Design an enzyme around this catalytic site. Structure first.
Site, PDB file in Angstrom:
ATOM      1  N   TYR A  26      37.390  34.931  47.772  1.00 15.90           N
ATOM      2  CA  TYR A  26      37.749  36.281  47.376  1.00 15.90           C
ATOM      3  C   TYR A  26      36.737  36.836  46.382  1.00 15.90           C
ATOM      4  O   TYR A  26      36.024  36.096  45.700  1.00 15.90           O
ATOM      5  CB  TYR A  26      39.157  36.322  46.773  1.00 15.90           C
ATOM      6  N   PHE A  36      36.194  42.270  38.513  1.00 20.02           N
ATOM      7  CA  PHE A  36      37.077  41.599  37.574  1.00 20.02           C
ATOM      8  C   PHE A  36      37.335  40.142  37.905  1.00 20.02           C
ATOM      9  O   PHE A  36      37.721  39.395  37.004  1.00 20.02           O
ATOM     10  CB  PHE A  36      38.420  42.340  37.445  1.00 20.02           C
ATOM     11  N   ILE A  56      49.738  37.925  44.887  1.00 11.02           N
ATOM     12  CA  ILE A  56      50.391  39.229  44.935  1.00 11.02           C
ATOM     13  C   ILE A  56      50.646  39.644  46.378  1.00 11.02           C
ATOM     14  O   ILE A  56      50.139  39.018  47.317  1.00 11.02           O
ATOM     15  CB  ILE A  56      49.542  40.280  44.207  1.00 11.02           C
ATOM     16  N   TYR A  82      50.113  45.577  40.369  1.00 13.16           N
ATOM     17  CA  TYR A  82      50.306  45.630  38.923  1.00 13.16           C
ATOM     18  C   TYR A  82      50.568  47.023  38.370  1.00 13.16           C
ATOM     19  O   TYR A  82      50.673  47.150  37.148  1.00 13.16           O
ATOM     20  CB  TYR A  82      49.084  45.033  38.197  1.00 13.16           C
ATOM     21  N   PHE A  99      39.175  44.276  47.433  1.00  9.71           N
ATOM     22  CA  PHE A  99      38.885  42.853  47.547  1.00  9.71           C
ATOM     23  C   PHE A  99      37.928  42.585  48.697  1.00  9.71           C
ATOM     24  O   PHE A  99      38.161  43.040  49.820  1.00  9.71           O
ATOM     25  CB  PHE A  99      40.162  42.046  47.763  1.00  9.71           C
TER      26      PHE A  99
END
Length: 107
Positions: A26, A36, A56, A82, A99
């Site tokens: 990923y 991030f 998630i 989130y 992603f």
């Protein structure tokens, strides 16, 4: 909403099932922002299974729509990951996630 934009190659028939441990390189990306998270740095390609809600929702549902060898491009809406809470210090509230996902699994 999870939206796949596939970089083609693979086989298009080998799909992950319940309880199968899959291996993903990923690469996270915030929209209009920097990275991030990445598994390319650690070189530990994140062995996880399907059906335990460990990841998630937006990352889980897009992996089920992939096959071996494929290279998708996720787009997670804030409501599934989130966007109400916001992860403290890393993911701000109401954030749209991108992603880079390659599925080179086993089993």
């Amino acid at each position: 909403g999870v939206e796949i934009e596939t970089i083609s190659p693979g086989d298009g028939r080998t799909f992950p099932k319940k309880g199968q441990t899959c291996v993903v390189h990923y690469t996270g990306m915030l929209q209009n922002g920097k990275k991030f998270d990445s598994s390319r740095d650690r070189n530990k390609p994140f062995k996880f299974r399907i059906g335990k809600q460990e990841v998630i929702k937006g990352f889980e549902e897009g992996a089920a729509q992939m096959s071996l060898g494929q290279r998708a491009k996720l787009t997670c809406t804030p409501d599934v990951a989130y966007g109400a809470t916001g992860h403290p210090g890393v993911i701000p509230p109401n954030a749209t996630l991108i992603f880079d996902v390659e599925l080179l699994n086993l089993e």
